[PDB]
Short mmCIF file of C-alpha atoms and ligand atoms in Angstrom, two decimals:
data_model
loop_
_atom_site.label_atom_id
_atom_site.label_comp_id
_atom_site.label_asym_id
_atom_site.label_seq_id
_atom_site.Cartn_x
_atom_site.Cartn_y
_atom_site.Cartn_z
CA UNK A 2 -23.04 -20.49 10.62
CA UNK A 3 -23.23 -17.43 8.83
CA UNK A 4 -20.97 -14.32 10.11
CA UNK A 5 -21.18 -10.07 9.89
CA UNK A 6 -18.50 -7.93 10.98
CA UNK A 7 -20.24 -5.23 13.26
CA UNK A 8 -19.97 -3.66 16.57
CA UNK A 9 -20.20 -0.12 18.11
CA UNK A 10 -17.50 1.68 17.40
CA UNK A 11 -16.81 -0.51 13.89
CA UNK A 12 -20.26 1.16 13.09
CA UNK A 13 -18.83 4.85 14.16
CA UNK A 14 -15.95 4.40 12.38
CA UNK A 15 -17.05 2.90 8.99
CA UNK A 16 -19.26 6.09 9.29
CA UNK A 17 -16.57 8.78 9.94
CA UNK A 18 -15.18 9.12 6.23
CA UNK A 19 -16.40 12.33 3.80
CA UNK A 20 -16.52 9.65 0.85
CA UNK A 21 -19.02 6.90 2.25
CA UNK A 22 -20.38 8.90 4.62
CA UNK A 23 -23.27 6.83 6.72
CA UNK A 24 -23.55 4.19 3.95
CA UNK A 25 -22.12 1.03 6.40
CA UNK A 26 -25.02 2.57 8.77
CA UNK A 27 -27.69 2.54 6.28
CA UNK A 28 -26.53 -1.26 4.81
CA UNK A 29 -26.59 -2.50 8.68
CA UNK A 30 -29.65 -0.85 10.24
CA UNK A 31 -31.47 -2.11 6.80
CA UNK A 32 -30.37 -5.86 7.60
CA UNK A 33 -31.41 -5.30 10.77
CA UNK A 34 -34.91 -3.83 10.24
CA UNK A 35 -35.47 -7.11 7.83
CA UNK A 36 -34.79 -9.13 10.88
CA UNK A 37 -31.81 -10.76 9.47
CA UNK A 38 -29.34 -9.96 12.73
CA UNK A 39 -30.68 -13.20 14.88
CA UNK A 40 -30.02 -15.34 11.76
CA UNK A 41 -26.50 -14.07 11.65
CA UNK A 42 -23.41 -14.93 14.06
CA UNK A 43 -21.78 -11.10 15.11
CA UNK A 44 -17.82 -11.11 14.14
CA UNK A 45 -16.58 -8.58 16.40
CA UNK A 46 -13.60 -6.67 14.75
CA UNK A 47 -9.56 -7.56 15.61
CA UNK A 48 -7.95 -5.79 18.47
CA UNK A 49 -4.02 -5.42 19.10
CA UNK A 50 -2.40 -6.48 22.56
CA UNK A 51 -0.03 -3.43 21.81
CA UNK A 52 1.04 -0.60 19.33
CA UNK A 53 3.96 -3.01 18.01
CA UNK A 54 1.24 -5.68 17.25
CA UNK A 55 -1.41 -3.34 15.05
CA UNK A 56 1.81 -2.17 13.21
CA UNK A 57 3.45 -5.77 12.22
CA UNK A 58 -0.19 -6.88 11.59
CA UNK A 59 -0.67 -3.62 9.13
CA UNK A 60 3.16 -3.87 7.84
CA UNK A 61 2.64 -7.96 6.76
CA UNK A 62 1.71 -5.63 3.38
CA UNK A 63 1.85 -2.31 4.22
CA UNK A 64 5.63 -0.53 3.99
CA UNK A 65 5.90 1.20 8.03
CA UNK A 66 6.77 4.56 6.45
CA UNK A 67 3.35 4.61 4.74
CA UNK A 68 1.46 3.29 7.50
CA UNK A 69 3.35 6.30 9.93
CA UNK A 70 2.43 8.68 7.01
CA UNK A 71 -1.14 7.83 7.38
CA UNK A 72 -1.14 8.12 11.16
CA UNK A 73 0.73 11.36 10.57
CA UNK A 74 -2.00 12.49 8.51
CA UNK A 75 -4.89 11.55 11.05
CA UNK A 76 -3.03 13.54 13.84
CA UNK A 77 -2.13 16.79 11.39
CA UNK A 78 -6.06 16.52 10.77
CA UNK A 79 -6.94 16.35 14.30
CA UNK A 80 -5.01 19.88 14.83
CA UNK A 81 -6.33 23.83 13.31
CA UNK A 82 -3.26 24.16 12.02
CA UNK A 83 -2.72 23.81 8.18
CA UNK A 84 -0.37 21.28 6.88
CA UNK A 85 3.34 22.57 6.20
CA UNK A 86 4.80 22.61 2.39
CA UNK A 87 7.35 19.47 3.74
CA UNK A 88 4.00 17.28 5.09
CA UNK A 89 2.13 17.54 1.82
CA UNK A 90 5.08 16.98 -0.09
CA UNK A 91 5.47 13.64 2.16
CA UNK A 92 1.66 13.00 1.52
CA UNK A 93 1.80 13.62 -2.20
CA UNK A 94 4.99 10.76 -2.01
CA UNK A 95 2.18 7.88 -0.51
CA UNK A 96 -0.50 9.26 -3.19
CA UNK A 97 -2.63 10.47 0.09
CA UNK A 98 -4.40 13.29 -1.54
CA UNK A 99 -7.59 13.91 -4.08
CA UNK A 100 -9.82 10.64 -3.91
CA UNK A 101 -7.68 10.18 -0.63
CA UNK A 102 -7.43 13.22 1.44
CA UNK A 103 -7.05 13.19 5.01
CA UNK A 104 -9.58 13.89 7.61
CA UNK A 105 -9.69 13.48 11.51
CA UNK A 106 -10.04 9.82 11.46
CA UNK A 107 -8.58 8.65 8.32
CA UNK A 108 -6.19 5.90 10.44
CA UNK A 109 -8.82 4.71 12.50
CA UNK A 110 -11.38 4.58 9.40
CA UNK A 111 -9.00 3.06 7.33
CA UNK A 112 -7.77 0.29 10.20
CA UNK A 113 -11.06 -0.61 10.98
CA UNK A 114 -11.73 -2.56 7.62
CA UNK A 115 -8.14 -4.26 8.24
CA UNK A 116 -9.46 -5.21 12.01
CA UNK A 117 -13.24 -6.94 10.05
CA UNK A 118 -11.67 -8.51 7.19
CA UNK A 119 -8.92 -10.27 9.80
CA UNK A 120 -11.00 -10.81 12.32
CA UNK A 121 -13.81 -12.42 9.31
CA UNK A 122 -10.67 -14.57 7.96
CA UNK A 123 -10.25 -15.74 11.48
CA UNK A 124 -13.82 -16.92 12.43
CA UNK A 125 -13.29 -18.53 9.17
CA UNK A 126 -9.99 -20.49 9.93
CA UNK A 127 -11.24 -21.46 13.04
CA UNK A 128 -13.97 -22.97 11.52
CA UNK A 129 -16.75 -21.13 13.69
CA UNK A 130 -18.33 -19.59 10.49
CA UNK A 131 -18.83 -21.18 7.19
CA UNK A 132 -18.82 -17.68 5.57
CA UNK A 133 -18.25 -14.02 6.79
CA UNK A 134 -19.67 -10.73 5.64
CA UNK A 135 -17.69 -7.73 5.95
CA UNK A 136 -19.68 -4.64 4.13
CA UNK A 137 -17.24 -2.55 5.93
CA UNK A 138 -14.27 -4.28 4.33
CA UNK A 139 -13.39 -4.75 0.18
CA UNK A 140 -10.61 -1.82 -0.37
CA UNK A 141 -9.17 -3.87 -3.25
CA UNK A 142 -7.30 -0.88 -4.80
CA UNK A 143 -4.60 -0.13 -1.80
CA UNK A 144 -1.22 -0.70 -2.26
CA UNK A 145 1.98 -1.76 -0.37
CA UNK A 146 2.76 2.30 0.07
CA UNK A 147 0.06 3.43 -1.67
CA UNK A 148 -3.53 4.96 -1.10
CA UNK A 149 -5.69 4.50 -4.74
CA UNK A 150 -9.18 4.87 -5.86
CA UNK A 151 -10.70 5.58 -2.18
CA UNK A 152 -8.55 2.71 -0.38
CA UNK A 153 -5.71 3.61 2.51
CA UNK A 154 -5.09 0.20 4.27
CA UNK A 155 -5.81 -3.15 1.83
CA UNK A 156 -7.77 -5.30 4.31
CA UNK A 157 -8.50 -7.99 1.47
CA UNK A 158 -4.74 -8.29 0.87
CA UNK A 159 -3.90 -8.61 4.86
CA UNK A 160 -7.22 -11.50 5.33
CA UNK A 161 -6.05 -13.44 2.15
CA UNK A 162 -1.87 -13.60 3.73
CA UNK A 163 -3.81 -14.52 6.92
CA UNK A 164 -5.91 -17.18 5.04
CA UNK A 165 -2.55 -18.89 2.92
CA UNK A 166 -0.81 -18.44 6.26
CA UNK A 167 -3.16 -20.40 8.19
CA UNK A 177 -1.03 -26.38 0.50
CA UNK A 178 -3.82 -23.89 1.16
CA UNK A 179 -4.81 -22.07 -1.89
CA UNK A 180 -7.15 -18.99 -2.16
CA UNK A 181 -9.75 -17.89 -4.66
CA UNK A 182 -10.25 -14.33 -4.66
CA UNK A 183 -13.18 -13.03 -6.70
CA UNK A 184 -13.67 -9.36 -7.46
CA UNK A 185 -17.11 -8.10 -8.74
CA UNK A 186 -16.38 -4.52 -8.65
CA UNK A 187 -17.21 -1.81 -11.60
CA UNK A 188 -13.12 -1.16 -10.81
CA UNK A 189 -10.28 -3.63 -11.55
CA UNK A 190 -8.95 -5.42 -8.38
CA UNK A 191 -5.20 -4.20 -9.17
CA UNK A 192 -3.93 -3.63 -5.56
CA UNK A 193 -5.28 -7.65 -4.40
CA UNK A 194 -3.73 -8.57 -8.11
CA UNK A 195 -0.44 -6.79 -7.42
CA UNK A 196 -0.07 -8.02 -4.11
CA UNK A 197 -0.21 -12.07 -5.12
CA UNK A 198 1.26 -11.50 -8.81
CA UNK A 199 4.24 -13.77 -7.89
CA UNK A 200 2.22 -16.37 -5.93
CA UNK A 201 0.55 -19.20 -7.43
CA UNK A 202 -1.42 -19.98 -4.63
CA UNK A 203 -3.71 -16.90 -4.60
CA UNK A 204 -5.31 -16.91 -7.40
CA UNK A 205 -7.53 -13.70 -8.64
CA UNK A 206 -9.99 -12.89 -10.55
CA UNK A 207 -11.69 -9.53 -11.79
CA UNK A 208 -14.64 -8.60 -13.75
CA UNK A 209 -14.86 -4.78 -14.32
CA UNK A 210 -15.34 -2.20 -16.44
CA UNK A 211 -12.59 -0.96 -18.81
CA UNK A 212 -12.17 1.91 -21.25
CA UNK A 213 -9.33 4.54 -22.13
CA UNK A 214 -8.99 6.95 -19.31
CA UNK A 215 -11.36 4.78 -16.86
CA UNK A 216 -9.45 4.12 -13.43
CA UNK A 217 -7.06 2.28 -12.82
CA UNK A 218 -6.20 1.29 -16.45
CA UNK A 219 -5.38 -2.27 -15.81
CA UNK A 220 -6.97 -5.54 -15.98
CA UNK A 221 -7.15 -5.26 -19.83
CA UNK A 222 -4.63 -5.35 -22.97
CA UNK A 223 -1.52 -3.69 -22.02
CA UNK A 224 0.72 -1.00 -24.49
CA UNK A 232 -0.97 -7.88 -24.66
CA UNK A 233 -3.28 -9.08 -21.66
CA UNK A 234 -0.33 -9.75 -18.50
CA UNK A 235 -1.18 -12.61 -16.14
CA UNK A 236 1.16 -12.99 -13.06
CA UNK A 237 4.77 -13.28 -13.27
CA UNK A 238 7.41 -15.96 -11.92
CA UNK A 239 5.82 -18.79 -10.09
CA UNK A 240 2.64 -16.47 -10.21
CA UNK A 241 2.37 -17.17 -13.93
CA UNK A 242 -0.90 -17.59 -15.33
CA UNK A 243 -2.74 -16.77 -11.37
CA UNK A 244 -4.18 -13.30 -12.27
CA UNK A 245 -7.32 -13.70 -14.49
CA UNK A 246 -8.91 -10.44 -16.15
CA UNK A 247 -12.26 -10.09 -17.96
CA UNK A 248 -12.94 -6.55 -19.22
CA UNK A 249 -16.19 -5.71 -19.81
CA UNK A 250 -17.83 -2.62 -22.54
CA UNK A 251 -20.23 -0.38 -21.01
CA UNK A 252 -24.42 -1.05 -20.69
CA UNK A 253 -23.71 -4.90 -19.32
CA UNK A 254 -27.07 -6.35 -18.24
CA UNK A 255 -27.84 -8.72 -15.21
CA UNK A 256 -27.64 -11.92 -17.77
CA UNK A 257 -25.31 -11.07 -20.47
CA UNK A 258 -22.79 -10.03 -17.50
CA UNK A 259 -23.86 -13.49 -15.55
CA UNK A 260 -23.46 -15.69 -19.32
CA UNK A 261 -19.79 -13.97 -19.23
CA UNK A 262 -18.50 -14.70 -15.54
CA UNK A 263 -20.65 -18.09 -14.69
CA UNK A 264 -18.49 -20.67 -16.87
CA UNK A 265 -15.02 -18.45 -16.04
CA UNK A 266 -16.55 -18.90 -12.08
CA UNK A 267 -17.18 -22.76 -12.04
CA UNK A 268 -13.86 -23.42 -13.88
CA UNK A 269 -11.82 -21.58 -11.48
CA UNK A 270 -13.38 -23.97 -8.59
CA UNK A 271 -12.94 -27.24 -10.62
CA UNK A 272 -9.08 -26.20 -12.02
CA UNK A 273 -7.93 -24.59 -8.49
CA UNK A 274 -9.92 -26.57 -5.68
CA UNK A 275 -9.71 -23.31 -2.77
CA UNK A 276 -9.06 -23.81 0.67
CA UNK A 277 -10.62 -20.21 0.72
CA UNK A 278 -13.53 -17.84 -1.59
CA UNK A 279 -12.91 -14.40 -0.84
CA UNK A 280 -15.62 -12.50 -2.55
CA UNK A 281 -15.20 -8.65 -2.99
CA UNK A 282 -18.75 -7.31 -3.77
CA UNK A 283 -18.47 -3.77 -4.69
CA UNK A 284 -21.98 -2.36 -5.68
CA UNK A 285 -21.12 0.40 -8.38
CA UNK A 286 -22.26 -2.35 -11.13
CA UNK A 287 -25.58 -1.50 -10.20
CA UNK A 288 -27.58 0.86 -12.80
CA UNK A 289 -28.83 2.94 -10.05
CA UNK A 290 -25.21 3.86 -9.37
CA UNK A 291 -23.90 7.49 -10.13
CA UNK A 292 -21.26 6.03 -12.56
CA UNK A 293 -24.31 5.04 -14.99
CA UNK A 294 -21.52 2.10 -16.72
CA UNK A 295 -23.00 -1.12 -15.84
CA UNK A 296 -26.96 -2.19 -15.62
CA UNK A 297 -26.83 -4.70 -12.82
CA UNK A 298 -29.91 -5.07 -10.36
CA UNK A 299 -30.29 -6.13 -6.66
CA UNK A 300 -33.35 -8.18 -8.21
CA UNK A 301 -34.33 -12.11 -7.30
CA UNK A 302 -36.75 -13.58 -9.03
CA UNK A 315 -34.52 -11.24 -14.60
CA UNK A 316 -31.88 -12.22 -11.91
CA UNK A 317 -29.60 -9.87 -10.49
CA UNK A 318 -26.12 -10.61 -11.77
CA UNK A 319 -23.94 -10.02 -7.81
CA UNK A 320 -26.99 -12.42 -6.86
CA UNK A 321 -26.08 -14.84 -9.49
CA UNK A 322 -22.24 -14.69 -8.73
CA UNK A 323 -22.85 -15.22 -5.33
CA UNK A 324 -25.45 -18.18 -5.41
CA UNK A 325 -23.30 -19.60 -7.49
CA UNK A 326 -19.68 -19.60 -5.41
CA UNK A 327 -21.83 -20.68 -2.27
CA UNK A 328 -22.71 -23.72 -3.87
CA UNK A 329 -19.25 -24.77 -4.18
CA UNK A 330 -18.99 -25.38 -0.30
CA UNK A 331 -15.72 -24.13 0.25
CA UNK A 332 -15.37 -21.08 3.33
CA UNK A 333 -15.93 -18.08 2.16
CA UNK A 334 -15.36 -14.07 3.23
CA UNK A 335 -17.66 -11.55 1.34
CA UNK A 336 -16.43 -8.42 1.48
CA UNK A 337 -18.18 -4.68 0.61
CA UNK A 338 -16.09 -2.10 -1.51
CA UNK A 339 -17.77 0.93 -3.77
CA UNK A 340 -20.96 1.80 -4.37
CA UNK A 341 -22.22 5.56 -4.03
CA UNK A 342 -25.85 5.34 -4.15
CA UNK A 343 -25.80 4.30 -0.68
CA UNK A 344 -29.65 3.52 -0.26
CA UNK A 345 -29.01 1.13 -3.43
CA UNK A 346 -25.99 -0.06 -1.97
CA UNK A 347 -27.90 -1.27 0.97
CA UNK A 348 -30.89 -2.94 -0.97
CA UNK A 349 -28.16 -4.95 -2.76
CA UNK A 350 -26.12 -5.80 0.08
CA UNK A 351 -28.89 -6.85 2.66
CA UNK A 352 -30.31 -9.01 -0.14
CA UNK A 353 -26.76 -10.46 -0.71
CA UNK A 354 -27.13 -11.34 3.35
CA UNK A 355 -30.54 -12.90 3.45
CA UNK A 356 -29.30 -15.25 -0.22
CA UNK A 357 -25.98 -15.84 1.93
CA UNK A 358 -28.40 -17.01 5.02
CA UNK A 359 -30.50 -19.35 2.56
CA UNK A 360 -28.09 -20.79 1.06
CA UNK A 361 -25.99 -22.17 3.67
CA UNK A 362 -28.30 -22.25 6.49
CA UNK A 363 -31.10 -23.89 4.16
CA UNK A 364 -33.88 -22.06 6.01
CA UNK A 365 -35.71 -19.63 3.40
CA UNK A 366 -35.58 -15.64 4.05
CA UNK A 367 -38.59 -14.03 3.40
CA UNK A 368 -37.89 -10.56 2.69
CA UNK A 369 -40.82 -8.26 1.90
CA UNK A 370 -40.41 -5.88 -1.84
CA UNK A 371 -41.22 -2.93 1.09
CA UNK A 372 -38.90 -1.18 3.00
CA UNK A 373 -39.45 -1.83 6.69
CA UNK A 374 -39.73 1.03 8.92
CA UNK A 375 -36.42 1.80 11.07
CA UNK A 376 -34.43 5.22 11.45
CA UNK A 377 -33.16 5.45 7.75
CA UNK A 378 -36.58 4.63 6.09
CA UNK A 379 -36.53 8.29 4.42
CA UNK A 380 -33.41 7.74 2.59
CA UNK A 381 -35.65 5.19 0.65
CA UNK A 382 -38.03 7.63 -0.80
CA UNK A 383 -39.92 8.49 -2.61
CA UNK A 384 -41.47 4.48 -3.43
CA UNK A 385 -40.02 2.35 -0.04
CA UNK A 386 -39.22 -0.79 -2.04
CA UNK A 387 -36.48 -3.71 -1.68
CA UNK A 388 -35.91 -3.74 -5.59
CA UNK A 389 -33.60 -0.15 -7.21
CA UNK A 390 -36.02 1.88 -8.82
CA UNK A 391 -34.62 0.63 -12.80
CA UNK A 392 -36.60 -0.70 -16.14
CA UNK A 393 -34.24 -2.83 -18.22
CA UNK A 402 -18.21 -12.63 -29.89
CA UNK A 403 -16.12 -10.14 -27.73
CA UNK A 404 -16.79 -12.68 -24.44
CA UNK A 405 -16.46 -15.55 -26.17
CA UNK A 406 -12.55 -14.59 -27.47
CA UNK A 407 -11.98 -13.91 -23.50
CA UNK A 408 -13.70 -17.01 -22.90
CA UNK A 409 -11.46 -18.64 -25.38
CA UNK A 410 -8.11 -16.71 -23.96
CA UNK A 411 -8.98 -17.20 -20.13
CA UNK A 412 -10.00 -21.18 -20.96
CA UNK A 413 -6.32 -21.31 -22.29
CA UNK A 414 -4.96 -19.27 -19.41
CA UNK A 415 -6.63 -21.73 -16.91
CA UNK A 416 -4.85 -24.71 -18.91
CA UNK A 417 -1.34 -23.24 -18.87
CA UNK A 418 -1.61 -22.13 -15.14
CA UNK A 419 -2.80 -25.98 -13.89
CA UNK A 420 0.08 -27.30 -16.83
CA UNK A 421 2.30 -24.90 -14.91
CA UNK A 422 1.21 -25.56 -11.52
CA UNK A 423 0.68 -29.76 -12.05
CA UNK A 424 -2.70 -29.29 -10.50
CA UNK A 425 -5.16 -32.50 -12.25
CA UNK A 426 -8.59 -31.23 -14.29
CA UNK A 427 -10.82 -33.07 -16.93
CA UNK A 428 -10.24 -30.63 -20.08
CA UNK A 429 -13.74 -31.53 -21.33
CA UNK A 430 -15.56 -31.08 -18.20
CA UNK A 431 -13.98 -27.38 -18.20
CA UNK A 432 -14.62 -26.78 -22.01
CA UNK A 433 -18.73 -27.90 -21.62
CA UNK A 434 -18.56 -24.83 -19.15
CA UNK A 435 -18.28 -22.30 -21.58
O1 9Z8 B 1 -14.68 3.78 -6.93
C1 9Z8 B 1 -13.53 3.36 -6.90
C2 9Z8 B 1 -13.20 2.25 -5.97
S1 9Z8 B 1 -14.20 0.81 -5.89
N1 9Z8 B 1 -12.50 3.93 -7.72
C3 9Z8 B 1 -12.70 5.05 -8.60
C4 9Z8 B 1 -11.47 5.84 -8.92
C5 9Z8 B 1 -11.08 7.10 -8.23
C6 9Z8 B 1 -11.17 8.34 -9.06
C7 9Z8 B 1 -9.95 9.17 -9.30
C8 9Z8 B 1 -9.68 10.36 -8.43
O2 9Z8 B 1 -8.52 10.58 -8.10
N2 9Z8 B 1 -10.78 11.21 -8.01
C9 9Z8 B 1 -10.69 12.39 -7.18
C10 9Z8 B 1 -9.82 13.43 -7.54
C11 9Z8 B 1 -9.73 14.59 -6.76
C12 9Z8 B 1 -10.53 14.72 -5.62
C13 9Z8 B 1 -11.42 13.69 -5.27
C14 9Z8 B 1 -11.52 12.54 -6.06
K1 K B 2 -13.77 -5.93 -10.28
K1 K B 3 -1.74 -14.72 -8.14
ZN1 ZN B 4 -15.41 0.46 -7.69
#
């Protein structure tokens, strides 16, 4: 069984943001119109019994004085009224401001993805879904009292403490053109969640992190060794990028053995994307690299929660993302998903123009010493953590 966070208002609220606009509309109605929806098992979002509930839920990461900040902010933006000098100084003290402004439903927009990424980890737990989809979800840069690089409320952090809560251990893998510092940050200490992020890095290129610091930092304490990094130079294609993060992939699996895969599959890798850094299709064949990734961690067999996170060519976005879908469906359904190079016709077929087609509209030493480094990293964090591998088996990887 295959899952997808959606319902009504999780659809209206996903939607009510200035950033990503209608993009969670576009990515659903164009799974839909491919006729993937009957294949797929609906994971209706988490609801509180109470107030107290939604805020010790939200506060299991979250600090309360940031999370009343941010409901502050949705009420002073459901008012006329401009803000006074003492309420933006508070808001400048939680970062919410520039990439994170308020708006009228910045608390409800930024609980939602907290409400599909639990509910997702639950139908997961319980064992009703094998995997979960969440393109709603993946806001991998939020911190404990902290909004950062578009993210308010980190859903990925609060479904991974409900996974290890549920020894379960917890692969999280984070595909995103931006390092996964928030999810990183969180489990730094913890050996049992252990992450991994392949992203861009340069000087000046948010957030800074997941690269060679004033050396390359790992976790701390217990955590040693649990936080794995591979920076990545601009112009990466689909198999250059795939050659660099398939061996580092199937390692992590053998070494750590997860209980729990949670994917974050943030689409701004794609060379259609407005940040023009990475040259990663949504094609299936000159494979598309997220396609790759993902083939590759469902094979493992171990429950997994894929999650969305940025992207800003929304129509791109969506071709990605409902291909991700109908690969998730193949693979562990085992029925084949025929899914036409044409755009179906539905509501948002415009926003497809001017061609109509599944594919993006694209003509396409350094990894080896981070091979080397991150093989040794894997070594000292199983050494550290008494966890049994075959060295050779791991070493053949790469
Ligand atoms: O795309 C992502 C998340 S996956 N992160 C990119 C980093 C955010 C860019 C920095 C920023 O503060 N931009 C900004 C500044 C003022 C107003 C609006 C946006
Ligand atoms: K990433
Ligand atoms: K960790
Ligand atoms: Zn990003």
């Amino acid at each position: 069984s295959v899952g997808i966070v959606y319902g009504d208002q999780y659809r209206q609220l996903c939607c009510s943001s200035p950033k990503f606009g209608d993009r969670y509309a576009l990515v659903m109605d164009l799974i839909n119109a491919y006729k993937l929806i009957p294949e797929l098992s609906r994971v209706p979002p988490l609801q509180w019994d109470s107030p107290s509930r939604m805020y010790e839920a939200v506060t299991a990461f979250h600090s309360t004085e940031y999370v009343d900040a941010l409901k502050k902010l949705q009420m002073l933006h459901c008012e006329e009224k401009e803000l006074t000098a003492d309420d933006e100084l508070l808001m400048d003290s939680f970062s919410l401001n520039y990439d994170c402004p308020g708006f009228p439903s910045v608390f409800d927009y930024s609980l939602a993805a907290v409400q599909g990424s639990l509910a997702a980890a639950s139908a997961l737990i319980c064992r009703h879904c094998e995997v979960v989809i969440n393109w709603g979800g993946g806001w991998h840069h939020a911190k404990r009292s902290e909004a950062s690089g578009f993210c308010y409320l980190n859903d990925i952090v609060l479904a991974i403490h409900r996974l290890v809560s549920s020894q379960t251990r917890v692969l999280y893998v984070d595909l995103d053109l931006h390092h996964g510092d928030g999810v990183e940050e969180a489990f730094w200490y913890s050996p049992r969640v252990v992450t991994f992020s392949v992203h861009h890095a340069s000087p000046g290129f948010f957030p800074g992190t997941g690269t060679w610091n004033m050396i390359f930092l790992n976790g701390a304490g217990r955590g040693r060794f649990s936080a794995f990094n591979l920076p990545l130079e601009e112009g990466i294609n689909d198999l250059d990028w795939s050659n660099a993060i398939g061996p580092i992939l199937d390692s992590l699996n053998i070494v750590i053995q997860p209980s729990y895969v949670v994917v974050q599959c943030g689409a701004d890798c794609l060379a259609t994307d407005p940040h023009r850094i990475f040259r990663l299709t949504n094609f299936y064949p000159s494979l598309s690299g997220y396609l790759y990734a993902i083939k590759k961690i469902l094979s493992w067999k171990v429950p997994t929660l894929i999650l969305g996170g940025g992207g800003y060519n929304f129509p791109d976005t969506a071709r990605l993302w409902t291909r991700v879908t109908a690969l998730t469906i193949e693979e562990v359904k085992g029925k084949k998903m025929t899914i036409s190079p044409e755009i179906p016709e539905h509501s948002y077929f415009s926003r497809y123009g001017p061609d109509f087609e599944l594919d993006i509209d694209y003509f396409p030493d350094s990894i080896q010493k981070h091979h080397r480094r991150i093989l040794e990293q894997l070594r000292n964090y199983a050494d550290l953590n008494k966890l049994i591998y075959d060295y050779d088996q791991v070493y053949q990887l790469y």
